[PDB]
Structure formats: structure tokens, C-alpha cells
Amino acid sequence: PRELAEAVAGGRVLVVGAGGIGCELLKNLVLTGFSHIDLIDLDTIDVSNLNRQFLFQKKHVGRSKAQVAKESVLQFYPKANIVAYHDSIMNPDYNVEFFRQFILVMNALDNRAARNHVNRMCLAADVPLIESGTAGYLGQVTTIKKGVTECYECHFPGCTIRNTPSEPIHCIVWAKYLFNQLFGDPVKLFTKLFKDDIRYLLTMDKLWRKRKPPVPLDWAEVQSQLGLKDQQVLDVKSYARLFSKSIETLRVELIWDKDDPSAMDFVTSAANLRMHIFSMNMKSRFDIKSMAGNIIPAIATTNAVIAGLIVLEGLKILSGKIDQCRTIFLNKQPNPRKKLLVPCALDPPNPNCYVCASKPEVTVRLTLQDKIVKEKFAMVAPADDFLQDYTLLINILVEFEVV
Amino acid sequence: GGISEEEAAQYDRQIRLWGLEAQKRLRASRVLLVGLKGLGAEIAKNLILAGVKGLTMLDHEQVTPEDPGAQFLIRTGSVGRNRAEASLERAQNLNPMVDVKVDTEDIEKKPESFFTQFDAVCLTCCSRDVIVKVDQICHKNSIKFFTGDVFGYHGYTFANLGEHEFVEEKTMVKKKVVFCPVKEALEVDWSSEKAKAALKRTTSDYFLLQVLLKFRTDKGRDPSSDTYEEDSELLLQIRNDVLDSLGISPDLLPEDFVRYCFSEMAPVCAVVGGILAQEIVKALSQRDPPHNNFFFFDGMKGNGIVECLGP
Amino acid sequence: YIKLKVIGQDSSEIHFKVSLRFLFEGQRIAVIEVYQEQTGG
Ligand SMILES: *NS(=O)(=O)OC[C@H]1C[C@@H](Nc2ncncc2C(=O)c2ccn(Cc3ccccc3)n2)[C@H](O)[C@@H]1O
Ligand SMILES: [Zn+2]
């Protein structure tokens, strides 16, 4: 209709993220007639993106997502106007004024922290926000509107790790801590960690009354012993060797990245030795990659469905039909009423929201700046955050805890 | 093991979803897709990214001036090109691992032996006669058959997988689901007291489909927004006659339905194309229960409904 | 006094007698259906 079409032709929209959801969404907005789009993504293209981020081909690996996405779209519709940022949305330059330019913001993000930031920015700028998320076969869409709707935020112990691990993940988390401790001579580290420390650990006699004791490993002793390559579980000797090999490659502040072969090999080997020591079956590098990297399994069709819904919701917003917007869940199997997609009316702001309520306050019983104000309460440039135009009053009453 | 190390790395995130064996099954499968308009373009993209052995994109029509100015697989300025040919370069480059081919001949003229090279056939923009005819061919040769279409804010998918066996994670449990010929699916008898009860719970989108397929049979084309007044009037008449024919009240389909069922809307193509390609993926890999047998999408209400209709 | 069943997004049927969001016939709780919010994209 003439009114919607002119809004779609006139206004400027922001897409935060050029991945699974974002590629699909960028295409859908263009084809729907959205004539002014800003696209931001901080990342470059990886080979594993190519099953579902359809604007990127193999030759593009290593380039910026947002820039390639624009180049790809312009090849099928040159008169698209798109501005691409190879940047993070949490950059203070994307301030309330920047956000104020857009008649609609759409998230295409993969983590809660970034969404929390965009939520505040959109509240502050008083621009509607379509929020969305996927994982495997599942996903959802909703509309966030200040004054009208709920906002996005309206709703292992060291001892298990260091002393009494009982599951593969504890060894994996341990291997990650170990990587940071060292990087965040192989034979000497190997014996210290896998022989000595497990002896020092057999000193604490109380612990091993109940559960099965660890068995120390000696370097020289160990040296004397269908599916994809990575899905194979190797023997102890192999991991011991890998551990060595990876330390070699690593020495030649680092942040752990699942995609760095050496760092990944490190954590795999370490965790597998630790697993062997505590009488657990060792795990394939494929499996350890999942668990250590927190890999979300992901495909084309789910993101494509969700990105289609996003635009339909945007059209309702821009047609002044927000009452007609919904939260839509994408199921794998139909509910009892045969609904594969489950729409629900939007909920009003929660009066006791720590974020979007009139004068928010909370009670907590450099650790404050980082692990509370920044981490727990998602502030970025901090209790004020003039970027997020948000003030939170903290009442001071397991390090800390929120009542 | 059965796939290269380049394939392993590229398909990594979906191998983590449906398993390597599922992927190997897709790797072995060849799909025929008919119609390279909005919905076919989405299905084509999804199946190609997924890594089928091959996709044959069949369309005998040319890009027209009415066609969208932006189409994600076709360059601007291809008015007069055959639509599949105009789609090939971009489709292929989505995934060089896939053998993407093009067929410019009318699906109606295809001999029964054309279909045997395919594990699955997916029709879009096809007439009811053609839909029935190809479903009958597929049944004979045990070929996975699908259809789907978008019209305005609505869209649908259909499957006939015959007797379909699959595994599902409860440990993987083998299960079986039985589907019916598309002819039965499209010609339900609403006479029965059983069928009378079923009607109460059936989405009106099913009757929308009936109206739109008859328009297609009558007019050789779909309604178009360029001929909105002309097509709206005819639709309202087809509504009357089709529903009267079924002993069903015309008023089951609201009279303003005409407002919501014109043209290809790209977001509706994406939703319907997503569900349909995934049904194809499920069917080829024999993993997870396929929808038996209709999915009906309404982009105004945000509804997606699976109906079992026919038996 | 009431025979109720909560089905999760994975069809996980479990029974009851008396991270998640709860629904009955499309109305937030305040067969039941449970929906998680996904954070991928
Ligand atoms: N779903 S997907 O992976 O296919 O695509 C998701 C894309 C989202 C892009 N991320 C992005 N883009 C723009 N601005 C910010 C971000 C962030 O994700 C971001 C920046 C800072 N943070 C906080 C953070 C830091 C470290 C760990 C966790 C969270 N998040 C992403 O590149 C994909 O292309
Ligand atoms: Zn809130």
C-alpha cells in the first residue's frame, strides 16, 4: 500500500549483524523495497559461515562480512543504498544520535551482551527494535517499543574444576583456564601438571575416600605405549604429543579462539590428558571444539524463516499496526493446535524492570566496575552510562549476588 | 570419511545439527525444482547451501517486465532471458560442490522417464492438473514429491512421501509415516460428520488454496497487482462457486481476502522457501518426522499451521 | 486434582499433578507448551 511503500522508500534502517540472520534479512529488506540500509558487523568471513550466509563465497574468506554483503547485494540490485560498517555496534560512536536516524533497528546478533546494549540504545533513541534469535531448528522474533512493550531485559565451582572433576566439561573448562594461565618447555609443564599436581592432589586424603582417585602420568612412560578425521579419538601418546606440539607452536597476551588450530589443539590435548587421569574416556577434537567453543549448530532454513518474519513484523510497525505485531516462535514440530509457528500478543513493560523502568534501582550484597556494573548489568562505558542514556541505582547490602 | 576435508569444514555447523550420515545422504541426492520465481529462488538457495548432489532448475518461462526489479539470483536487466538460465550463475556460485543444472523445457512435455533421475521433485507455480500428474508419476517410481506456492501474505507447502521411514532422536528410533496422493489431499469430501468436525479446526488457508488453484486453471496465470481490480472481482466469484461447490459457506473465506493474496512478497518466499527446503532435506536424509501433509502460512497473523488432509 | 502435561520444544512429553516461558492455548501462564528464547543468529 502507498503509505507503507513510501515509508519503506523514505526511511533509513539499521541491521546489527551480517551473519546467518543478517544476510537473509539484508536480502529480504532490499527485495521488499527498503531503499536505505545501514549494516554493521565486526567480523570477517570464515569457511564455516558458508553453509548459511549466502552473500559470501569461498573467495571472500577473510574479508569483512558487512562489506561483502553489500557488494553481493549490489550485484543483483545496483541501486540499493547500503552503508556497511566493519565495526562493533558497541563502539561509542554509535550513540543515541546515530540510532535516532533510523525508523527501525533489527538485531541479527549471536549473544545476549550485544543485544542488551542495542536494547538500551533503542529505548534511549525511541526507535522500535525487532529482536530475533535462532539455534539449530528453533528460533523466534519479537518487537520492542519503548512505552509500549516489554524491553529485552524485562524478564562450575573452582573445587569441581581444580580438585574433583567428574564430567568431560570440567576437564575442558580446566584446559581453558590452563591456556589463559600460560598464555592469557613441554616436558616440564607436562609432568608438573599431569604428574606432580595430581600427586599434590592425592595429598588431600579426605577427597578420595568416596570417589575414584586420579592416576598420575609420567611423560617417558606415556611415550612408551567411522566419521571425519576430527571425530576420531586418539590414544594417550597422541594427545601427550599434541600437547607438546601445540605448546611449541604457541610460544613462537593471547586470547583463546576455537579457530586457532594450535590453541584448539592445546585445549583438546590438555583436557584429554586430564580426562584420562580421572578415569574418563577421552573426547574427539570435534566434540571438544563444540564444548570449548560453545558452538551453536546452525543451518540456512531456520535463519531464512526468521529473517522473513522479521521483515513482516517491520512492515506492521511501519504501517502503524504495532498492535498487530507478535512474538513468534518457530517450532520443529507443531503444537497441539497444529501450530508450527506460534504467534503471541506483545507484553507491556514490566514495572519492575532494572533497565527500562522510570527510575531503576537494584540491590547487591575494579571487581565492581568489571564483574558487576559491566558484566552483570551490561554497561559498556560506565551508576551512569551516558552512551546508553541509562542510570541505575545500586543499593549495597560466590563473590557477590543480586537479590 | 565419505566426504572431503573441504566439505567437512564448510558443512561443519550443520553436521553438528543433523550428523554426518544425514549429510552423506544429501550428498547422494538429486532434486528437481520447477519454477524459478520468488519461492523457487529461496528453495534453490537453501538446497544448494545444504549440499545436495545436484539441483536441476526447470522453468520454461522468460523474465518479464512485471517481474520484481530485485531478484537475488538474477541480474537486473534480464528481461527476456529464460528464468532458469538467468538464475544459474548466482545459484551455482552459492556452492560449487553442487551439480546445478538448468532445463528450459515445459514440465508438462516431460516424459515419465525424465523424473527417474531424481530423489525428490518440488513444483512451484504449477497448475493443479500438472501437480496431480507429476504426483502420479512420482508415486509409481517412489519419488519424494513436493509442491508449494506464495500469494501475497500467504503461502503453502505440500508433501507426498508415500510410505516414509525415518529416524528421530527420542538413541535413534526408526519410525514410519504414511502420506496420500495429492489428488485426495486437494479433493476432500466435507459431507461426513467426521469431515464436518474436522472443518471447524481446518485453517481457511486451505480454501484460499482451492480458490487460487482454480484462478490458475482458469486464467493461465496467478492474480497480479497490475490487474488488481479485474483479478479481485474474479477471485470473489471463484470464492462463491468453489465454496458453494463444497457445500461450505463462502463466508469461511472473508470477502477482503483479495487484499492479502496478490504478488510474490519476498519475506513470504523466505518463510515458505525455508520450511519447504527443510522438508526436502528431512525427506532426503530420512531424519526427523516430515509434516503430514500441508503447511499453510499467513504472514498477516504470523500463523504457520500443519494440516493432514486427504485420508 | 488435575491431569496436566508440559510439552517442550523438542516434543519432550512429561506428566504432572498438582529459561522457560509457559503457554496454554496461546496465553502466557499467569497440555502446557514451553518455549525457550534462542540467542544465536
Ligand atoms: N548468528 S551468526 O553467527 O550467523 O551471525 C551473527 C553475526 C553478529 C556479528 N556480531 C556483532 N556484530 C556487530 N556488532 C557487534 C557484534 C557482536 O556480536 C559483539 C560485539 C561485542 N560483543 C560482546 C561480546 C564479546 C565477546 C564475547 C561475547 C560477546 N558482541 C557476528 O560477527 C556475526 O557475523
Ligand atoms: Zn524492561
PDB file of N, CA and C in Angstrom, chain A residues 20-21 109-112 115 133-135 138 140 150 152 155 329-331 335-336 342 344 347, chain C residues 7-11 20-21 23 25-28 31-41:
ATOM      1  N   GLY A  20      24.174 -15.287   9.618  1.00  0.00           N
ATOM      2  CA  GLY A  20      23.046 -16.130   9.276  1.00  0.00           C
ATOM      3  C   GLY A  20      21.767 -15.327   9.067  1.00  0.00           C
ATOM      4  N   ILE A  21      21.281 -14.727  10.158  1.00  0.00           N
ATOM      5  CA  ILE A  21      20.094 -13.899  10.124  1.00  0.00           C
ATOM      6  C   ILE A  21      20.362 -12.698   9.238  1.00  0.00           C
ATOM      7  N   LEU A 109      21.991 -10.718  15.897  1.00  0.00           N
ATOM      8  CA  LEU A 109      23.117 -10.940  16.785  1.00  0.00           C
ATOM      9  C   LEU A 109      23.162 -12.386  17.260  1.00  0.00           C
ATOM     10  N   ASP A 110      24.305 -12.735  17.891  1.00  0.00           N
ATOM     11  CA  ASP A 110      24.541 -14.096  18.352  1.00  0.00           C
ATOM     12  C   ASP A 110      24.900 -14.152  19.840  1.00  0.00           C
ATOM     13  N   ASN A 111      24.605 -13.099  20.614  1.00  0.00           N
ATOM     14  CA  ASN A 111      24.913 -13.196  22.039  1.00  0.00           C
ATOM     15  C   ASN A 111      24.093 -12.160  22.811  1.00  0.00           C
ATOM     16  N   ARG A 112      23.870 -12.433  24.106  1.00  0.00           N
ATOM     17  CA  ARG A 112      22.992 -11.631  24.945  1.00  0.00           C
ATOM     18  C   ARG A 112      23.603 -10.253  25.222  1.00  0.00           C
ATOM     19  N   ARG A 115      22.943  -7.684  22.533  1.00  0.00           N
ATOM     20  CA  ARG A 115      21.529  -7.352  22.444  1.00  0.00           C
ATOM     21  C   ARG A 115      21.093  -6.411  23.569  1.00  0.00           C
ATOM     22  N   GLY A 133      16.223 -14.431  17.208  1.00  0.00           N
ATOM     23  CA  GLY A 133      17.295 -15.332  17.566  1.00  0.00           C
ATOM     24  C   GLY A 133      17.041 -16.709  16.981  1.00  0.00           C
ATOM     25  N   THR A 134      18.122 -17.461  16.712  1.00  0.00           N
ATOM     26  CA  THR A 134      17.976 -18.820  16.210  1.00  0.00           C
ATOM     27  C   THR A 134      19.002 -19.720  16.888  1.00  0.00           C
ATOM     28  N   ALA A 135      18.727 -21.029  16.857  1.00  0.00           N
ATOM     29  CA  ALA A 135      19.673 -22.071  17.227  1.00  0.00           C
ATOM     30  C   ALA A 135      19.135 -23.413  16.737  1.00  0.00           C
ATOM     31  N   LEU A 138      15.380 -24.102  15.714  1.00  0.00           N
ATOM     32  CA  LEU A 138      14.460 -23.292  16.506  1.00  0.00           C
ATOM     33  C   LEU A 138      14.794 -21.805  16.398  1.00  0.00           C
ATOM     34  N   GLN A 140      13.066 -17.367  17.109  1.00  0.00           N
ATOM     35  CA  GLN A 140      11.927 -16.520  17.403  1.00  0.00           C
ATOM     36  C   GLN A 140      12.181 -15.076  16.994  1.00  0.00           C
ATOM     37  N   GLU A 150       7.302  -4.769  26.654  1.00  0.00           N
ATOM     38  CA  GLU A 150       8.489  -5.287  27.312  1.00  0.00           C
ATOM     39  C   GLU A 150       9.750  -4.896  26.539  1.00  0.00           C
ATOM     40  N   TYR A 152      14.078  -5.884  26.137  1.00  0.00           N
ATOM     41  CA  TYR A 152      14.748  -7.177  26.011  1.00  0.00           C
ATOM     42  C   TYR A 152      15.123  -7.728  27.385  1.00  0.00           C
ATOM     43  N   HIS A 155      12.497  -9.492  31.563  1.00  0.00           N
ATOM     44  CA  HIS A 155      12.451 -10.706  32.369  1.00  0.00           C
ATOM     45  C   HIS A 155      13.866 -11.052  32.837  1.00  0.00           C
ATOM     46  N   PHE A 329       7.164 -17.809  17.718  1.00  0.00           N
ATOM     47  CA  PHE A 329       8.103 -18.889  17.948  1.00  0.00           C
ATOM     48  C   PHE A 329       8.086 -19.819  16.747  1.00  0.00           C
ATOM     49  N   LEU A 330       9.297 -20.209  16.315  1.00  0.00           N
ATOM     50  CA  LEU A 330       9.411 -21.241  15.301  1.00  0.00           C
ATOM     51  C   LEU A 330       9.753 -22.563  15.992  1.00  0.00           C
ATOM     52  N   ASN A 331       8.787 -23.488  15.926  1.00  0.00           N
ATOM     53  CA  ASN A 331       8.888 -24.861  16.390  1.00  0.00           C
ATOM     54  C   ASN A 331       9.486 -25.745  15.300  1.00  0.00           C
ATOM     55  N   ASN A 335       2.474 -27.579  17.660  1.00  0.00           N
ATOM     56  CA  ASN A 335       1.924 -27.674  18.998  1.00  0.00           C
ATOM     57  C   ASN A 335       0.611 -28.456  18.897  1.00  0.00           C
ATOM     58  N   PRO A 336      -0.127 -28.697  20.012  1.00  0.00           N
ATOM     59  CA  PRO A 336      -1.437 -29.365  19.958  1.00  0.00           C
ATOM     60  C   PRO A 336      -2.502 -28.728  19.064  1.00  0.00           C
ATOM     61  N   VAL A 342       4.137 -20.105  16.278  1.00  0.00           N
ATOM     62  CA  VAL A 342       3.257 -19.781  17.389  1.00  0.00           C
ATOM     63  C   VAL A 342       3.343 -18.277  17.657  1.00  0.00           C
ATOM     64  N   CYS A 344       2.070 -14.810  19.520  1.00  0.00           N
ATOM     65  CA  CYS A 344       1.570 -14.375  20.826  1.00  0.00           C
ATOM     66  C   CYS A 344       1.579 -12.852  20.870  1.00  0.00           C
ATOM     67  N   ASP A 347       3.762  -8.104  25.303  1.00  0.00           N
ATOM     68  CA  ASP A 347       3.539  -7.841  26.717  1.00  0.00           C
ATOM     69  C   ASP A 347       3.941  -6.406  27.048  1.00  0.00           C
TER      70      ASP A 347
ATOM     71  N   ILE C   7       4.705 -30.064  27.306  1.00  0.00           N
ATOM     72  CA  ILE C   7       5.498 -30.451  26.145  1.00  0.00           C
ATOM     73  C   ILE C   7       6.501 -29.342  25.812  1.00  0.00           C
ATOM     74  N   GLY C   8       7.787 -29.709  25.708  1.00  0.00           N
ATOM     75  CA  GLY C   8       8.853 -28.766  25.389  1.00  0.00           C
ATOM     76  C   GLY C   8       9.128 -28.718  23.882  1.00  0.00           C
ATOM     77  N   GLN C   9       9.980 -27.787  23.440  1.00  0.00           N
ATOM     78  CA  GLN C   9      10.099 -27.546  22.006  1.00  0.00           C
ATOM     79  C   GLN C   9      10.669 -28.762  21.275  1.00  0.00           C
ATOM     80  N   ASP C  10      11.078 -29.790  22.030  1.00  0.00           N
ATOM     81  CA  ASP C  10      11.647 -30.993  21.446  1.00  0.00           C
ATOM     82  C   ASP C  10      10.684 -32.173  21.579  1.00  0.00           C
ATOM     83  N   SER C  11       9.421 -31.878  21.908  1.00  0.00           N
ATOM     84  CA  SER C  11       8.364 -32.879  21.963  1.00  0.00           C
ATOM     85  C   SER C  11       8.506 -33.751  23.208  1.00  0.00           C
ATOM     86  N   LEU C  20      12.597 -20.606  30.586  1.00  0.00           N
ATOM     87  CA  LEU C  20      11.370 -21.135  30.019  1.00  0.00           C
ATOM     88  C   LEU C  20      10.247 -20.095  30.080  1.00  0.00           C
ATOM     89  N   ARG C  21       9.293 -20.239  29.148  1.00  0.00           N
ATOM     90  CA  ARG C  21       8.062 -19.464  29.088  1.00  0.00           C
ATOM     91  C   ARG C  21       6.915 -20.450  28.864  1.00  0.00           C
ATOM     92  N   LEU C  23       2.794 -21.624  28.212  1.00  0.00           N
ATOM     93  CA  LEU C  23       1.613 -21.237  27.454  1.00  0.00           C
ATOM     94  C   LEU C  23       0.523 -22.308  27.527  1.00  0.00           C
ATOM     95  N   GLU C  25      -2.951 -22.621  25.167  1.00  0.00           N
ATOM     96  CA  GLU C  25      -3.792 -22.152  24.074  1.00  0.00           C
ATOM     97  C   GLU C  25      -3.411 -20.728  23.669  1.00  0.00           C
ATOM     98  N   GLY C  26      -2.109 -20.427  23.680  1.00  0.00           N
ATOM     99  CA  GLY C  26      -1.613 -19.119  23.291  1.00  0.00           C
ATOM    100  C   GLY C  26      -2.022 -18.038  24.285  1.00  0.00           C
ATOM    101  N   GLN C  27      -1.568 -18.185  25.535  1.00  0.00           N
ATOM    102  CA  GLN C  27      -1.761 -17.202  26.590  1.00  0.00           C
ATOM    103  C   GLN C  27      -0.759 -17.502  27.708  1.00  0.00           C
ATOM    104  N   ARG C  28       0.181 -16.566  27.933  1.00  0.00           N
ATOM    105  CA  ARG C  28       1.283 -16.743  28.870  1.00  0.00           C
ATOM    106  C   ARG C  28       0.738 -17.172  30.225  1.00  0.00           C
ATOM    107  N   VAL C  31      -2.590 -29.600  27.942  1.00  0.00           N
ATOM    108  CA  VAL C  31      -1.134 -29.531  27.616  1.00  0.00           C
ATOM    109  C   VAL C  31      -0.652 -28.089  27.784  1.00  0.00           C
ATOM    110  N   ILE C  32       0.424 -27.921  28.541  1.00  0.00           N
ATOM    111  CA  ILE C  32       1.073 -26.630  28.564  1.00  0.00           C
ATOM    112  C   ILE C  32       2.233 -26.720  27.581  1.00  0.00           C
ATOM    113  N   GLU C  33       2.519 -25.605  26.897  1.00  0.00           N
ATOM    114  CA  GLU C  33       3.648 -25.565  25.983  1.00  0.00           C
ATOM    115  C   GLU C  33       4.725 -24.646  26.541  1.00  0.00           C
ATOM    116  N   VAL C  34       5.965 -25.079  26.346  1.00  0.00           N
ATOM    117  CA  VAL C  34       7.119 -24.354  26.847  1.00  0.00           C
ATOM    118  C   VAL C  34       8.015 -23.988  25.670  1.00  0.00           C
ATOM    119  N   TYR C  35       8.484 -22.737  25.707  1.00  0.00           N
ATOM    120  CA  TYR C  35       9.317 -22.115  24.692  1.00  0.00           C
ATOM    121  C   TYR C  35      10.511 -21.480  25.396  1.00  0.00           C
ATOM    122  N   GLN C  36      11.706 -21.791  24.872  1.00  0.00           N
ATOM    123  CA  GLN C  36      12.963 -21.126  25.186  1.00  0.00           C
ATOM    124  C   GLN C  36      13.178 -19.973  24.206  1.00  0.00           C
ATOM    125  N   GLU C  37      13.986 -18.997  24.614  1.00  0.00           N
ATOM    126  CA  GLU C  37      14.447 -17.914  23.767  1.00  0.00           C
ATOM    127  C   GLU C  37      15.831 -18.300  23.226  1.00  0.00           C
ATOM    128  N   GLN C  38      16.021 -18.331  21.887  1.00  0.00           N
ATOM    129  CA  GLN C  38      17.325 -18.657  21.301  1.00  0.00           C
ATOM    130  C   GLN C  38      18.163 -17.388  21.123  1.00  0.00           C
ATOM    131  N   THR C  39      19.498 -17.514  21.191  1.00  0.00           N
ATOM    132  CA  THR C  39      20.403 -16.358  21.251  1.00  0.00           C
ATOM    133  C   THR C  39      21.432 -16.348  20.103  1.00  0.00           C
ATOM    134  N   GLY C  40      21.408 -17.387  19.267  1.00  0.00           N
ATOM    135  CA  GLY C  40      22.152 -17.474  18.002  1.00  0.00           C
ATOM    136  C   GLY C  40      21.614 -16.523  16.922  1.00  0.00           C
ATOM    137  N   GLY C  41      22.360 -16.411  15.815  1.00  0.00           N
ATOM    138  CA  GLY C  41      21.954 -15.594  14.686  1.00  0.00           C
ATOM    139  C   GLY C  41      23.084 -15.386  13.683  1.00  0.00           C
TER     140      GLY C  41
END
